[PDB]
Amino acid sequence: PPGGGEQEPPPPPAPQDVEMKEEAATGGGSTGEADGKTAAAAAEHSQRELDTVTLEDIKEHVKQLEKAVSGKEPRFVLRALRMLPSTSRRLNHYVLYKAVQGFFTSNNATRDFLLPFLEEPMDTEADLQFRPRTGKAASTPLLPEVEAYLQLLVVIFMMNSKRYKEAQKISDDLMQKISTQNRRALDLVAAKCYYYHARVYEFLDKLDVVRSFLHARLRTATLRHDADGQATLLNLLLRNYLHYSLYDQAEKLVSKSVFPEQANNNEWARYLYYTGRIKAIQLEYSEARRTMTNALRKAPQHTAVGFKQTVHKLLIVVELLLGEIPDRLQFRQPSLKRSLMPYFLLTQAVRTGNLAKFNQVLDQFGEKFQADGTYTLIIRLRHNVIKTGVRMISLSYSRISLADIAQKLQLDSPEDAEFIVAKAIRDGVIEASINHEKGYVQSKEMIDIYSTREPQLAFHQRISFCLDIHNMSVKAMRFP
Amino acid sequence: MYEQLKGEWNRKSPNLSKCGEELGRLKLVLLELNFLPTTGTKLTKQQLILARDILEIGAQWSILRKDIPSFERYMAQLKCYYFDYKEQLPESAYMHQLLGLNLLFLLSQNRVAEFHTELERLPAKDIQTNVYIKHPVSLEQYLMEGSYNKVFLAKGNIPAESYTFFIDILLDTIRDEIAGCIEKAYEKILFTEATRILFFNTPKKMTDYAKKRGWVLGPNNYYSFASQQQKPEDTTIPSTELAKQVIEYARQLEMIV
Amino acid sequence: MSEKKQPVDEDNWDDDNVEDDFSNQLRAELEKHGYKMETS
Amino acid sequence: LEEGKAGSGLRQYYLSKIEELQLIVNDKSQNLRRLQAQRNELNAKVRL
Amino acid sequence: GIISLLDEDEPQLKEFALHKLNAVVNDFWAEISESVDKIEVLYEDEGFRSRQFAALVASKVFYHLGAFEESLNYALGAGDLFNVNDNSEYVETIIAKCIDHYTKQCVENADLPEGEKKPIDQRLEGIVNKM
Amino acid sequence: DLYSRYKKLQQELEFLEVQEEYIKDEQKNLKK
């Protein structure tokens, strides 16, 4: 109390003041923009939702004693807000109760009164007209309530709060979404409640119970129209079915719901991660690595974020399933130190023709390979141990004797050198050909890639994308 | 009820009459109640021991009788019974070779994409033990790099029954790949190239490809015809579609005024 | 902007292109690469 | 449910119907005022 | 995986499997897309009591696949097992399109008074006045 | 009200399809 207790009065009141006026001006601003000029995609909806991912998770973790978040429940226990006097009565109460919680002690939430902080705030004439207010101020008290992590009769405090909030969401979904479309708000609300309800089903039994309900929310999605609702629920529905290590992937191959068609640069980024995971395991290697490449370069705007460490981890494997390998560890992180040492020393052995070192890597770093969800490399990367050099030779040489290629690939027999090169050309490693008469493996024709109509194909791709930006820009620019 | 558990299976199974009685046994079990909810109830897991066992013996009968669509029919429902949601389920010791029947079968019909996505369900039985699952994945490893001959040499080593209905189709769908490599326009080889590339010093198989395909042994010489294309190209003949392709350029510049 | 996909997470300053090219090919480059001539 | 069965059967038919009919009119007024000012620029050219 | 049960050629195995279809058709959406060829048949197969209750599970999978007229004609062919229903998110949408199909039919029939009108199904107008 | 709102949305929708038409037509004819 003389050391830290004197610096206990400054942390409540300024987050009680100006952080309160954030959602007070936003929730006032989002409501009036839901009333008039209802197409508010170009408004404060997005960045406030970018804040609720980032800011309010690190603005507060505990329920903020001396009445900053512990005071939110005696603040919003009494909200009528129904008619224009009932709002202006409560606008006086927004002045009164915030002043009382800024001065003195209201109902102090000592981590236990959460269900009477879900009835009586929802009671005392709380509206479904302010269903964004009930939607936000039920999803935001998940975050002091989960991140306490004491988990002692709080799992049901999670469970009741989500079912209250989603029954409010269902009551929106059937009754009068008059020019509002709370799906923009309630998508990440459906996500954030079910990131941790997934975590609840990590501490306890399996989470196909989530997936049956998540089909039902996706069944009521896609029927109205798609405005990010199908997009957010699809990545959620895919994740457990990929997280389970059963068969599980032909369900996604038949999942013909491939189109969100616009995803605000962030759903589309990790959507391409999960479908790249799928196309890699069913041996469609070349299409997988190029959409893994598209996923890697789409959201790098982060700070050592860890899933960037994951997409970078898979992409080097699938290109080691194609022979080529780039520089990888040139952007070393405080966490990449753990993940560079296996895979750089892995491809060190892949480029060489060594195998007793390669099996030494497997015994050294099998636990991390099993932890990363990549058991399958040992059955599929031993293929490209011979396919790396034969692509390297057919890139270097032009007309090789197959007798000479056996010692150069240390194949220890000249007669099966027909068969590997037959496997290379039938699968399309190199466009070369064999003369089965005196040992020739001769290469392609002369390079003719300017006067043979091929520059027109790439030039048509760049027309069809660049002026497509032009037409999409002119429509999107002039709203007034 | 409790109908003919080991009647004509443990000694010998040449019969189709008990196959019709197993059909009647399928009528008795799938009219008991159901298998869909599986909430709790070890007492209704009691016939789930029975229902899986009688489809194990239906799977053994299916591969014994040389039947392709029905073997995958019973095996899918067996896999549906290892798709049990509430799986207390003490281990029926026939499971691993039962999967190895399916894992080898689905390799044989060239479902290689389905081959590797099935392998996800086993935590450590692929490597630590279980030669029944270790045999197809070591086999599929031999198909990867260059190793045709080790497949044909390690045919004669099976821990289980001989897997004969799988492996003969499995080798036959290797022979056509060697054929489809050697059916090119590369014109003539001799009978010793048939022994090296195709296989088999003097077989009935050289009579097989003499009557199926050509490859007739003339004056100690096989004649494979030219499989070479003609390539009739002008490639200015994309002139209409190229003139078309220019039009939607100027269209999409204009027309939105 | 988390995705909840986090949960886990000149010495060598510009060398890795040259290092991915050659690593250990008797880097002194003289005792065989220059000493061919006694073998010819 | 005197009205609860009537709200989801014969009013929800209307409430779902007038939703997108509001969304198009919300869309075209954005698109119209874009076309207005683009005519306002070119007419301000020619009269000058 | 009970589509393999629907291959097998006895009647009382069929409907038990396609009792299990509309039990979990909301959870196994796109796997039944390949079983479309089996049902669109079994519906044409007349002598079985597995045609209207097969037209239920047919109408569910074209509803997921967006084929809305396909769900419309097959919910007609679902008979009284569809017409008895009154409350779902499923049923109220395809009867809303049924009103849409009917009112664009009737205005089309109002365009030609000189005979020549269209043959109109009676289950679709039977749920018009039921509504 | 639930029917009268529905026709008023149609009448306005028919109208402001006409006004976006000729303005797109007038702006073409104004360039000449």
Short mmCIF file of N, CA and C in Angstrom, two decimals, chain A residues 248-336:
data_model
loop_
_atom_site.label_atom_id
_atom_site.label_comp_id
_atom_site.label_asym_id
_atom_site.label_seq_id
_atom_site.Cartn_x
_atom_site.Cartn_y
_atom_site.Cartn_z
N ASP A 248 -11.51 -37.12 -42.39
CA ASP A 248 -11.74 -35.69 -42.20
C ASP A 248 -11.47 -34.74 -43.36
N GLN A 249 -10.89 -35.18 -44.47
CA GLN A 249 -10.56 -34.20 -45.50
C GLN A 249 -11.35 -34.35 -46.79
N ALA A 250 -12.00 -35.49 -47.03
CA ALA A 250 -12.90 -35.58 -48.17
C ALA A 250 -14.20 -34.82 -47.91
N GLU A 251 -14.49 -34.52 -46.65
CA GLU A 251 -15.60 -33.63 -46.32
C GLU A 251 -15.34 -32.22 -46.84
N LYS A 252 -14.08 -31.82 -46.90
CA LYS A 252 -13.74 -30.48 -47.35
C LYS A 252 -13.54 -30.44 -48.85
N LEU A 253 -13.12 -31.56 -49.44
CA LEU A 253 -13.01 -31.65 -50.89
C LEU A 253 -14.37 -31.54 -51.54
N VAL A 254 -15.40 -32.08 -50.89
CA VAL A 254 -16.76 -31.91 -51.40
C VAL A 254 -17.39 -30.62 -50.89
N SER A 255 -16.71 -29.88 -50.02
CA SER A 255 -17.26 -28.62 -49.53
C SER A 255 -17.21 -27.58 -50.64
N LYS A 256 -18.29 -27.51 -51.41
CA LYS A 256 -18.39 -26.56 -52.51
C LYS A 256 -19.10 -25.30 -52.01
N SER A 257 -18.36 -24.54 -51.22
CA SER A 257 -18.78 -23.24 -50.73
C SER A 257 -17.60 -22.29 -50.79
N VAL A 258 -16.87 -22.34 -51.92
CA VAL A 258 -15.50 -21.85 -52.00
C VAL A 258 -15.42 -20.33 -52.06
N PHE A 259 -16.55 -19.63 -52.12
CA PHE A 259 -16.58 -18.21 -52.47
C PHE A 259 -17.06 -17.35 -51.30
N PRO A 260 -16.16 -16.60 -50.66
CA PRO A 260 -16.62 -15.41 -49.93
C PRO A 260 -16.62 -14.17 -50.82
N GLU A 261 -15.70 -14.17 -51.80
CA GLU A 261 -15.54 -13.23 -52.91
C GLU A 261 -15.02 -11.84 -52.54
N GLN A 262 -15.00 -11.52 -51.24
CA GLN A 262 -14.32 -10.36 -50.68
C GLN A 262 -14.28 -10.56 -49.17
N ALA A 263 -13.12 -10.32 -48.58
CA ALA A 263 -12.99 -10.71 -47.18
C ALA A 263 -12.14 -9.76 -46.35
N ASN A 264 -11.94 -8.53 -46.83
CA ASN A 264 -11.30 -7.44 -46.08
C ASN A 264 -9.87 -7.79 -45.69
N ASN A 265 -9.18 -8.52 -46.58
CA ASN A 265 -7.75 -8.82 -46.55
C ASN A 265 -7.36 -9.71 -45.37
N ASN A 266 -8.31 -10.23 -44.61
CA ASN A 266 -7.91 -10.95 -43.42
C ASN A 266 -8.57 -12.31 -43.28
N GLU A 267 -9.85 -12.43 -43.63
CA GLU A 267 -10.45 -13.75 -43.70
C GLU A 267 -9.87 -14.52 -44.88
N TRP A 268 -9.72 -13.84 -46.02
CA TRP A 268 -9.21 -14.44 -47.24
C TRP A 268 -7.77 -14.90 -47.08
N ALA A 269 -7.01 -14.27 -46.18
CA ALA A 269 -5.62 -14.65 -45.97
C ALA A 269 -5.51 -16.03 -45.33
N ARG A 270 -6.26 -16.27 -44.25
CA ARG A 270 -6.15 -17.56 -43.58
C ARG A 270 -7.07 -18.61 -44.18
N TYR A 271 -8.07 -18.19 -44.95
CA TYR A 271 -8.83 -19.13 -45.76
C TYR A 271 -7.93 -19.83 -46.77
N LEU A 272 -7.03 -19.07 -47.40
CA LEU A 272 -6.07 -19.66 -48.32
C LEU A 272 -5.02 -20.50 -47.60
N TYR A 273 -4.84 -20.29 -46.30
CA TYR A 273 -3.95 -21.18 -45.55
C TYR A 273 -4.58 -22.55 -45.38
N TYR A 274 -5.86 -22.60 -45.01
CA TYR A 274 -6.47 -23.88 -44.71
C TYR A 274 -6.71 -24.70 -45.97
N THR A 275 -7.08 -24.05 -47.07
CA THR A 275 -7.26 -24.82 -48.30
C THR A 275 -5.93 -25.18 -48.94
N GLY A 276 -4.85 -24.47 -48.60
CA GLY A 276 -3.53 -24.92 -49.03
C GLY A 276 -3.08 -26.13 -48.25
N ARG A 277 -3.49 -26.22 -46.98
CA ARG A 277 -3.25 -27.42 -46.18
C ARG A 277 -3.95 -28.63 -46.78
N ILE A 278 -5.12 -28.41 -47.37
CA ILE A 278 -5.89 -29.51 -47.92
C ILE A 278 -5.29 -30.00 -49.23
N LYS A 279 -4.98 -29.07 -50.13
CA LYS A 279 -4.46 -29.46 -51.44
C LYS A 279 -3.04 -30.00 -51.38
N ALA A 280 -2.33 -29.77 -50.28
CA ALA A 280 -1.02 -30.38 -50.10
C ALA A 280 -1.12 -31.84 -49.69
N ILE A 281 -2.15 -32.22 -48.94
CA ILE A 281 -2.19 -33.58 -48.43
C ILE A 281 -2.78 -34.54 -49.46
N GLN A 282 -3.56 -34.05 -50.42
CA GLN A 282 -4.02 -34.87 -51.54
C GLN A 282 -3.17 -34.66 -52.78
N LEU A 283 -1.87 -34.44 -52.58
CA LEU A 283 -0.80 -34.53 -53.57
C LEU A 283 -0.89 -33.51 -54.70
N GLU A 284 -1.84 -32.57 -54.67
CA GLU A 284 -1.89 -31.49 -55.65
C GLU A 284 -0.88 -30.44 -55.21
N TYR A 285 0.39 -30.70 -55.50
CA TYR A 285 1.48 -29.94 -54.91
C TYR A 285 1.61 -28.55 -55.52
N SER A 286 1.54 -28.46 -56.85
CA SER A 286 1.87 -27.20 -57.52
C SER A 286 0.79 -26.16 -57.32
N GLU A 287 -0.47 -26.58 -57.25
CA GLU A 287 -1.53 -25.63 -56.92
C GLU A 287 -1.49 -25.25 -55.45
N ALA A 288 -1.01 -26.15 -54.59
CA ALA A 288 -0.98 -25.86 -53.16
C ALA A 288 0.07 -24.81 -52.83
N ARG A 289 1.27 -24.96 -53.38
CA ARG A 289 2.36 -24.06 -53.01
C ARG A 289 2.14 -22.64 -53.52
N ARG A 290 1.38 -22.48 -54.61
CA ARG A 290 1.16 -21.14 -55.13
C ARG A 290 0.04 -20.43 -54.39
N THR A 291 -0.89 -21.17 -53.80
CA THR A 291 -1.87 -20.50 -52.95
C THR A 291 -1.38 -20.41 -51.51
N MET A 292 -0.42 -21.25 -51.12
CA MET A 292 0.30 -20.98 -49.88
C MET A 292 1.18 -19.75 -50.02
N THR A 293 1.75 -19.54 -51.21
CA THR A 293 2.52 -18.33 -51.47
C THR A 293 1.62 -17.11 -51.45
N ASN A 294 0.40 -17.25 -51.99
CA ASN A 294 -0.55 -16.16 -51.97
C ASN A 294 -1.01 -15.86 -50.55
N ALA A 295 -1.10 -16.89 -49.70
CA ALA A 295 -1.52 -16.67 -48.32
C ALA A 295 -0.41 -16.04 -47.50
N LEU A 296 0.85 -16.35 -47.82
CA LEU A 296 1.97 -15.82 -47.04
C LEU A 296 2.15 -14.33 -47.27
N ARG A 297 2.03 -13.89 -48.52
CA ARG A 297 2.24 -12.49 -48.87
C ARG A 297 0.99 -11.65 -48.72
N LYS A 298 -0.06 -12.17 -48.10
CA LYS A 298 -1.30 -11.41 -48.05
C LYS A 298 -1.52 -10.69 -46.73
N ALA A 299 -1.16 -11.29 -45.60
CA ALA A 299 -1.18 -10.59 -44.32
C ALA A 299 0.16 -10.76 -43.60
N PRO A 300 1.19 -9.98 -43.98
CA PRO A 300 2.44 -10.00 -43.21
C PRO A 300 2.51 -8.88 -42.19
N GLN A 301 1.49 -8.01 -42.20
CA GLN A 301 1.49 -6.78 -41.41
C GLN A 301 1.17 -7.13 -39.96
N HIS A 302 2.15 -7.71 -39.29
CA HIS A 302 2.00 -8.22 -37.94
C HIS A 302 3.32 -8.04 -37.22
N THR A 303 3.39 -8.57 -35.99
CA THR A 303 4.57 -8.45 -35.13
C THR A 303 4.88 -9.82 -34.51
N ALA A 304 5.67 -10.63 -35.23
CA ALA A 304 6.15 -11.96 -34.79
C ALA A 304 4.99 -12.88 -34.39
N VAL A 305 4.04 -13.02 -35.31
CA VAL A 305 2.68 -13.31 -34.89
C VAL A 305 2.44 -14.80 -34.68
N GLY A 306 3.26 -15.67 -35.28
CA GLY A 306 3.21 -17.08 -35.01
C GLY A 306 2.48 -17.91 -36.05
N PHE A 307 1.36 -17.41 -36.59
CA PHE A 307 0.79 -18.13 -37.72
C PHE A 307 1.53 -17.81 -39.00
N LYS A 308 2.17 -16.65 -39.07
CA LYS A 308 3.14 -16.40 -40.12
C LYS A 308 4.32 -17.36 -39.99
N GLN A 309 4.65 -17.76 -38.76
CA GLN A 309 5.65 -18.79 -38.55
C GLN A 309 5.14 -20.16 -38.99
N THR A 310 3.82 -20.31 -39.12
CA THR A 310 3.25 -21.60 -39.48
C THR A 310 3.13 -21.76 -40.99
N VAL A 311 2.66 -20.71 -41.68
CA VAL A 311 2.53 -20.77 -43.13
C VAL A 311 3.90 -20.79 -43.80
N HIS A 312 4.88 -20.13 -43.19
CA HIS A 312 6.25 -20.21 -43.68
C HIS A 312 6.85 -21.59 -43.43
N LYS A 313 6.31 -22.32 -42.46
CA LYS A 313 6.83 -23.64 -42.15
C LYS A 313 6.33 -24.69 -43.13
N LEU A 314 5.09 -24.57 -43.58
CA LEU A 314 4.54 -25.56 -44.50
C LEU A 314 5.03 -25.34 -45.93
N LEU A 315 5.24 -24.08 -46.31
CA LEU A 315 5.53 -23.75 -47.70
C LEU A 315 6.91 -24.23 -48.12
N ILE A 316 7.85 -24.28 -47.19
CA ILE A 316 9.17 -24.78 -47.54
C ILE A 316 9.14 -26.29 -47.70
N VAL A 317 8.18 -26.96 -47.06
CA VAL A 317 8.08 -28.41 -47.18
C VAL A 317 7.54 -28.79 -48.55
N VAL A 318 6.49 -28.10 -49.01
CA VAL A 318 5.87 -28.47 -50.28
C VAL A 318 6.74 -28.08 -51.47
N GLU A 319 7.66 -27.13 -51.29
CA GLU A 319 8.62 -26.87 -52.35
C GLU A 319 9.79 -27.83 -52.28
N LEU A 320 10.10 -28.34 -51.09
CA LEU A 320 10.95 -29.52 -51.00
C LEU A 320 10.24 -30.78 -51.49
N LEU A 321 8.92 -30.72 -51.70
CA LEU A 321 8.24 -31.74 -52.47
C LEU A 321 8.25 -31.45 -53.96
N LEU A 322 8.91 -30.36 -54.38
CA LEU A 322 9.05 -30.03 -55.79
C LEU A 322 10.50 -29.77 -56.19
N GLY A 323 11.45 -29.89 -55.27
CA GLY A 323 12.86 -29.81 -55.60
C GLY A 323 13.51 -28.48 -55.30
N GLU A 324 12.83 -27.38 -55.59
CA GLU A 324 13.38 -26.06 -55.38
C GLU A 324 13.28 -25.66 -53.91
N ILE A 325 14.17 -24.76 -53.49
CA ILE A 325 14.14 -24.24 -52.13
C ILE A 325 14.75 -22.84 -52.08
N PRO A 326 14.05 -21.86 -51.52
CA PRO A 326 14.63 -20.52 -51.38
C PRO A 326 15.34 -20.29 -50.06
N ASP A 327 15.85 -19.07 -49.87
CA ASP A 327 16.27 -18.60 -48.56
C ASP A 327 15.04 -18.41 -47.69
N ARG A 328 15.13 -18.83 -46.43
CA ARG A 328 14.00 -18.79 -45.51
C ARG A 328 14.26 -18.00 -44.23
N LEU A 329 15.42 -18.15 -43.59
CA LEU A 329 15.62 -17.63 -42.24
C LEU A 329 16.18 -16.22 -42.21
N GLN A 330 16.09 -15.49 -43.31
CA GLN A 330 16.70 -14.17 -43.40
C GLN A 330 15.89 -13.08 -42.69
N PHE A 331 14.83 -13.44 -41.97
CA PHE A 331 14.00 -12.48 -41.24
C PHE A 331 13.82 -12.96 -39.81
N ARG A 332 14.93 -13.28 -39.14
CA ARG A 332 14.88 -14.02 -37.88
C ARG A 332 14.21 -13.21 -36.77
N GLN A 333 13.41 -13.92 -35.98
CA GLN A 333 12.45 -13.37 -35.03
C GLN A 333 12.87 -13.76 -33.62
N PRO A 334 12.23 -13.23 -32.56
CA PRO A 334 12.44 -13.82 -31.23
C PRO A 334 11.86 -15.22 -31.07
N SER A 335 11.03 -15.68 -32.00
CA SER A 335 10.45 -17.02 -31.94
C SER A 335 10.87 -17.92 -33.09
N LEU A 336 11.39 -17.36 -34.19
CA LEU A 336 11.82 -18.14 -35.35
C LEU A 336 13.09 -18.94 -35.08
#
